[PDB]
Design an enzyme around this catalytic site. Structure first.
Site, PDB file in Angstrom:
ATOM      1  N   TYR A 145       0.808  -1.210   0.000  1.00 23.27           N
ATOM      2  CA  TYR A 145       0.000   0.000   0.000  1.00 23.27           C
ATOM      3  C   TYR A 145       0.845   1.265   0.000  1.00 23.27           C
ATOM      4  CZ  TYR A 145       0.322  -2.466   4.461  1.00 23.27           C
ATOM      5  OH  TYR A 145       0.730  -3.260   5.506  1.00 23.27           O
ATOM      6  N   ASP A 146       2.165   1.133  -0.062  1.00 26.05           N
ATOM      7  CA  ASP A 146       3.062   2.271  -0.156  1.00 26.05           C
ATOM      8  C   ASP A 146       3.160   2.763  -1.596  1.00 26.05           C
ATOM      9  OD1 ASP A 146       5.459   0.710  -1.416  1.00 26.05           O
ATOM     10  OD2 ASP A 146       4.967  -0.409   0.404  1.00 26.05           O
TER      11      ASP A 146
ATOM     12  N   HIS B 133      -4.290  -4.503  -2.876  1.00 20.98           N
ATOM     13  CA  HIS B 133      -4.718  -4.264  -1.506  1.00 20.98           C
ATOM     14  C   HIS B 133      -4.936  -2.785  -1.216  1.00 20.98           C
ATOM     15  CE1 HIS B 133      -4.696  -8.340  -0.558  1.00 20.98           C
ATOM     16  NE2 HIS B 133      -3.526  -8.473   0.038  1.00 20.98           N
TER      17      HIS B 133
END
Lengths: 324, 318, 317
Positions: A123-124, A160
């Site tokens: 999610y970065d 995600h």
């Protein structure tokens, strides 16, 4: 630097035949423009991005005041989200993840391999940052609305979610409820991921063999018809060499494992060079640093030139384009 | 007449045409071709196959479920060999392609999804010079040679005129998700990522309603509404139009466009197809507001640049 | 115990109430976990995983490792080797612990268990209870009695084979496909009866799967199942509320009595014995309670104009 090149050449020279075939197939897919990288949390960890176990530690701290199985990593955040408010969960997410981190050399290597798409459970924005610098544009898809209005052909699909909209829990698949309702909440994202896997050559990097996502994908892969798909490649970068039984178990499940520990010797906590060994093997295979015999030279030049036999004459300014 | 029918078009029809042509220019247009286009080329309909299956099963000769159940009964009773024989003797024919096949190809679709098990679209693509990776089996998805697919979601008879290669009987539609995960996933991905135009479907078709059911699961605005070219002889009732447009379809009715006979399906298909084709070069500019809107759409990105070469402005306006 | 009941929390006594009324009504079902079987010194699955690990890698665990190593062993060593280890580990005789007797003394309508042993079976025969033991698909149709002994994960009555039981991964993955009738029967029993979970950990896989299916049901269409927690430490307040909202009514043994870390039998007994002795007890202390209990017995008789005094001995049992 130079000694690293010599050691890499030695490693490739003693490489097993199956590993040589895996490297050759990956490089051929890279040339064909059909290569897609499935990047895990190991690559993000290599840039010192806050791992999820620290988040679970803080949630446990706020829950019981004291400081984990596979179920705990999903349940304790769900415990916190239920007993405490959504605002506290989002605030902890913000104070842990609202950071900037450098892009590790594995990011640059992944982009230098020329991936058609990049699927990631991270999610970065590290892969986004690495993509942006190299000048190759990727249509980042992390939410549901991003699938329909995808600007370009290349997708950077974050299955995600991520924090581009904000550091809130509903944008990311973190807690136990998110994984349970992932199919219902992410129909288009999951469908796009499955289509990319079906139509491209997939390389898993940054994942453990016992990862949740790897097991879920191998479960979906089971439902497919026999030999109806191409076996994804798995870059394993665990400190100890893979056991033969586990290796054959996961290869019979539809994986081609390239085990970094089996290729080079390295220290237990020395993950970066384990990733770099496989990545650099792939890249210098692409850069032709590993051919040494006259049979290989003729084969390479013939592969570049034989299609041109159909044409009568070829401009010398085009022979430069033929050899890149 | 095509210009005359254009000047009197409903505003929503004009918007649908604009969206379709814009997507066609951007290479994001996909045609979902139904059996209506295929039967226009006189390819045998499925109800004749059902009639033959009934004639062999019973003495002499349906419901919507009967079209799938009678072949299912015939299979289960008589045999895959008999089902194979009837399919081979009914479908091993050569039929010429329609002008609507060529019209669909002239629309320049990125992909062509079809429920037809014939080679009419393949023949049209081969004749027109369009190269498509034909995907009719599960092993075809990974082996596709191009990024432009001719997706036959119900299979075809390239491997042979066998019942196992196609989706005809009742069990095939039951086990479609289990038997065709890759093909169904590719179809839904194409629907999600492209602009979809349905042609050859009757708005009550099994596949249309199944896609609408799948669309129901998607988020409120995560998807674009597929376009539906309705070519039934009678104009769509307003309540039916409201119902199907609230389900995610944007319907352009051939009967509402032009007036024709009940059995003149060729004319009804051709009206919409030619109205789409002849609109490719048209910019829909009548009023000064439209002139300013179009010129601003062309010029406003150039506001970022401090200056533009005048000789470069010919590329701005094509 | 009578003292223990006196300062029992009002929630626990209420939980003890509904369990007892259901037992009298004949609609009590016990969901028995491996914890009760472990009390009888049955071979725990973690040692089966250890043996499979030793025969795989040569040297001796997350939640999925309990399911994956047996699956790895089954894939690469085969069905004969998997069942060979199964036989030399599970072909033992073990006595029924008193908790098995105390479970039957509750007079349960059905007994659902994830244990693949016969400890409940021999306990039922010693007690004299008749249960139609169902551990396969065919047993559901051929059930000869209304009372069911539902082994949702199978057993070894047919043989010490891996197919008869749900042990490894790809048995939990394809559980709904290979056990549609047994899974339907278990869900039907849970919907129509009051369920007490015993021998299960709060993080057990089966509990989560049942709680996952429970969330699909509409609000208040189901009775909240009862959970007997026998972990050595008292349950955390935050964890307790989480599982209560998930649908469980938790009875915590560690909170009821002070017990040693490894003295599980006293923890199981303290709740079983409290349940058993609450069967006769009317939970009758204050005058308002006394009127409430007598009213419940007598109020239906208000429909009748007159009651024979000799018949009143039947009203109060």
């Amino acid at each position: 630097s130079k000694r690293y090149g010599e050691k890499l050449k030695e490693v490739f020279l003693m490489l097993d035949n199956n590993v040589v075939e895996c490297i050759k197939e990956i490089t051929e897919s890279s040339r064909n423009g059909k290569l897609v990288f499935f990047v895990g949390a190991g690559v993000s960890t290599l840039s010192d991005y806050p791992q999820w176990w620290r988040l679970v530690d803080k949630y446990h701290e706020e829950l019981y005041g004291s400081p984990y199985s596979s179920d705990e990593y999903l349940r304790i955040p769900q415990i916190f989200y239920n007993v405490k408010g959504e605002m506290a969960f989002d605030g902890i997410l913000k104070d842990f993840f609202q950071v900037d981190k450098p892009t590790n050399p594995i990011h640059d290597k992944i982009l230098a391999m020329n991936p058609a798409h990049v699927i990631t459970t991270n999610y970065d924005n590290l892969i986004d940052t690495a993509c942006w610098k190299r000048g190759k544009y990727f249509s980042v898809i992390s939410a549901e609305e991003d699938v329909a209005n995808a600007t370009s052909s290349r997708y950077l699909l974050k299955v995600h979610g991520d924090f581009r909209k904000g550091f809130k829990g509903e944008n990311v698949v973190l807690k136990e409820d998110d994984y349970l309702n992932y199919d219902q909440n992410y129909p288009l994202i999951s469908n796009l991921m499955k289509t990319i896997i079906a139509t491209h050559t997939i390389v898993f990097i940054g994942y453990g063999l016992g990862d949740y996502n790897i097991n879920m994908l191998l479960n979906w892969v089971r439902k497919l018809q026999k030999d109806s798909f191409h076996k994804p490649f798995f870059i394993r970068t665990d400190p100890s060499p893979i056991e033969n039984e586990t290796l054959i178990y996961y290869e019979n499940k539809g994986l081609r494992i390239i085990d970094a520990a089996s290729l080079i010797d390295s220290n237990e906590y020395d993950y970066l060079e384990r990733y770099s060994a496989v990545m650099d093997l792939l890249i210098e295979s692409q850069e032709n640093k590993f051919i040494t015999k006259d049979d290989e030279v003729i084969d390479y030049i013939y592969g570049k030139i034989s299609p041109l036999f159909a044409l009568q004459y070829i401009r010398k300014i085009d022979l430069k384009h033929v050899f890149e």
